[model samples]
Target: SMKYKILKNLQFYYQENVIVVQINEKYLTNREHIFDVEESEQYFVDVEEILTKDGKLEIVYNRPNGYTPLLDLKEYADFYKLDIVNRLLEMNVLEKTNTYLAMQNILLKDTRDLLFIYKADHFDNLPYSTKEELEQWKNFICSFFGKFTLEKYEKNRIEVLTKEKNSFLNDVEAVESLESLRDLIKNRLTEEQKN
Candidate 1:
């Protein structure tokens, strides 16, 4: 989804005993200066856009004035939407800070084992080997790749997880994709560190 125009041009306005937020000028109607609140000593206003479980945009606000749990933004992302977890995978800071490498190392151990697991499943096709290797893969997947894949499936099950047949191929593919992205990010970070 394209970034919301409201978020793109979001600005704060301090008025007499109130804080007014200017929403999108082009698209959203009846929402220009829609957020008005009584003045108060404020530290940080937790205003954010959230994609709901049912695939809807919700705006959450928490501040000194009041709290809004889920305010339906009535907005939607059209493209292959990259939500928080998706965004996190591409976070430059993760690689720059070494978290990406740390995660990669941990996941790489499992990924290496995954090759054997696949061979056991496809080539050997032994019930014992398949069960044992599958168990090993499951443990590793849940331990390392679980965080992102589980969250991804939770937010977008229809796309990430199967409904009728219980499986994790899509989730596995997602982890592999993450590994590929990690390689790219690692190379770039390495270059940046040197230069």
Candidate 2:
């Protein structure tokens, strides 16, 4: 059966005027703003996008005022996403400022994994000396970070949109294919990341 996993653990913190749901995870990093919250606030959910051949199970997030959750799932994905990114950054697979990039990478990898599942492909077929190698590759490439993907990341930016879906010959071509995969990823990510 199809299932949607929650992105992170939830916690409540009392604030002065409102019960501020402190998001400990970030769906994306390299964030420039802090809304009077602690720098350590994490995420609440893994934002999602639904994909079906007939568009039957497509999940799209309805954002209003940039606050997308009924105040639940979004927070979970966001916090979890950030946590993983920071962990990678600490491990040097990512740079300190590459939180957003890390998030983007994870989003793409996860989307690919989902699509692989949707297509009923056995990812375990990949060549690996040990389970740790397999797990490392999976973590480095596929873990769905807060429902983000490369295509959606580009879509958010006007500069590199259409090129996201091209051939795979050179680096440019590879990127296009990456974008195609990302498009699938974005659909799922955006729905979850929205307000």
Candidate 3:
């Protein structure tokens, strides 16, 4: 169900209200727009010269009038969206003054640890990491560089937890993929931050 389009000219495919590029099924970070794809008419890439083995069809979504959700995207909680906004802003890819840029800068950069460290000082709106939450993050991030592998007993432990609808375990699979996990981690952090 995943598709790729090679560049003839990157911006040529995007239209006025339809998506320029899809970062994921949800969450459009490109120029700060995210409307549900379920609402739009299908748009086709009709470039005669470009060689797509099949037609370049996308689940093109509509951007509603007067809609910009940098601070509050449709389906996300307030802090969750801010976490994303803050991360991108820190990455120097997103603009502080609503001047959005193409997100290729983050795509090429490698900084996964930004997702775990709760930087509450970024805004009065964001929450500070609790002492317990701080330790959780420290240990979580430590696993990335620690000289350890998934031994069999630990594998069974993870499997048992995942089977129980552990929301945190969902984070396990959520982060297992690409951008989806970062967003999911935002959700998990919100759920677990208080207790």
Candidate 4:
């Protein structure tokens, strides 16, 4: 009985890249504000491979397992105001003897994997950024990753070539090409670059 919604659709960096990334809308937290949630507690949606990256080509679904007690049964029933404790019991969120988190009995458990498949051509051989820069980008992305999405934004910006047709980087501000990248690096080495 999981509630579901269409999350997001972002195309691969190039048209034929093997890995395509998407978000799963339903599996994220029901918190009033996402900024307040811890990164560890955020959900992962789903991971699929269009082509084999590792030897095994199966689509892996990784998610959280375990239940956290929201409140005592009476308190829970009162908070939900609908005898949720009983429903949870019926749904198996509560067991007769154990307080530990369990898969077969939990509501918010079995979180969807936040799927990001990396294709071979996702980055260029002459990418403007170096390996260290790539590592830093990875660190930043991993730190703030969340499964929740903004449908209109993702679709308008990256997912569709719509009635509003524009290049994917139409709103970007920075080096526009390989030459621009070289210029940027050159400028960065100059004394005025710091200013």
Against the true structure, whose lDDT is highest? 3
Evaluated at residue 121, the lDDT of candidate 2 is: 9
Q: List model 4 lDDT by residue over 32-95, tens digit each.
A: 3322211222122233332324431222323323422121121231223122222332332112
Query: What are the candidates' C-alpha RMSDs?
Result: 20.0, 18.3, 17.4, 21.1
| Candidate 1 per-residue lDDT over residues 1-195, each given as its tens digit | 111122123322322323233433343333323222211111223343322334222333332322211112113221111121233344322221211111111101111110000000112211112222223333323323333342343345444335424333343434344465445434544554464
Ranking, lDDT, top scorer first: 3, 1, 2, 4
Q: Kindly list the per-residue Cα lDDT of model 3 for residues 12-88, writing each as its tens digit.
A: 12234533332222221232122222222211121122122233323333333332322112244434433543354
Q: Tell me each candidate's TM-score.
A: 0.20, 0.19, 0.20, 0.17
lDDT of candidate 2 at residue 43, scale 0 to 100 = 27
Q: What is the lDDT of every predicted structure here? A: 0.27, 0.26, 0.29, 0.25
Clashes of 1: 0
Instruction: Point out where model 1 deviates above 4 Å.
Output: 1-87, 90-176
Candidate 2 lDDT score relative to the true structure = 0.26
Q: For each candidate, how many residue pairs have backbone atoms clashing (under 3 Å)?
A: 0, 33, 1, 8
Candidate with more favorable, higher TM-score: 2 or 4: 2
